[PDB]
Amino acid sequence: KTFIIGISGVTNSGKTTLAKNLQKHLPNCSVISQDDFFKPESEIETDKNGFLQYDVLEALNMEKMMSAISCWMESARHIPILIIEGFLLFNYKPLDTIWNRSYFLTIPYEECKRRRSTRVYQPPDSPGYFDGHVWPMYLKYRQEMQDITWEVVYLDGTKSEEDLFLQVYEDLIQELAKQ
Ligand SMILES: Nc1ncnc2c1ncn2[C@@H]1O[C@H](COP(=O)(O)OP(=O)(O)O)[C@@H](O)[C@H]1O
Ligand SMILES: NC(=O)c1csc([C@@H]2O[C@H](CO)[C@@H](O)[C@H]2O)n1
């Protein structure tokens, strides 16, 4: 009765952008962004080397988010589409049995690091934060995904913004078609 779509991938791979596009052209379509569930700065930890721990599941209120998803799901039974976009989704076990479609955006190390630097975060990226925490954590996430039993459709984040949208858009109808 409801279609749940997952969109993950490394930071700045283009998740927000894909989510918004599908959102505009998809009927009865909602969006939940994993980033709205970050714990307050006062709750974040810094490792030995003085790096704030943001790229780990512990830096996000995931029980808050699952509750937000349950709300949507149950109020939906009253075809509803939910796009859940986030940089750390396919390694959070409670979601595995909820996905109807999973997409993973990939972007090279150089492009990613570049895009990242055009964005001022809060707290701002400390010196060598990207190499010292962001990249290492993504790689650690990519590895925690070697265990995935279901099917994740990999996307090329270097591709056109509309080419990615269209690739996903077609498929989503060739998936709703069997509905
Ligand atoms: N396909 C694309 N090609 C080039 N730049 C892109 C593309 N998609 C997004 N961007 C840019 O990359 C940066 C971050 O994109 P964003 O959608 O926020 O990705 P994410 O949600 O994974 O961090 C922004 O400058 C965005 O405009
Ligand atoms: N305040 C925040 O929410 C925050 C500070 S840095 C940050 C970044 O969010 C990215 C995932 O989208 C992750 O790489 C964090 O470094 N978030």
Cβ neighbours of 45 (radius 10 Å): 12
Write the burial class of residue 86 (CB in 10 Å: 0-12 exposed, 13-18 middle, 19+ buried). buried
Q: How close is the Cα of 17 to the center of ligand 1, in Å?
A: 6
Q: How close is the Cα of 125 to the center of ligand 2, in Å?
A: 9
Q: What determination technique applies here? A: X-ray
Helix (H) or strand (E) holding 137: helix 135-143
- Decide: 155 and 105 in contact? Cβ < 8 Å: yes
Domains contained in the chain, CATH given: 1-179 (3.40.50.300)
Q: Is 147 a catalytic residue?
A: no
- Candidates 14, 6, 11, 5; CA nearest to 156 is 14
Instruction: Report phi then psi at 13, rounded to 5.
Output: -80, -15
Task: Measure Cα distances from 68 to 21, 33, 82, 93, 177 in Å.
Answer: 22, 11, 11, 16, 28
Strands (E), 2-109: 3-9, 29-33, 81-85, 101-106
What is the stated resolution of the deposited model, in angstroms? 2.7
Catalytic residue among 35, 47, 131, 163: 35
SS3 of 154, please? strand
Strands (E), the chain: 3-9, 29-33, 81-85, 101-106, 152-156
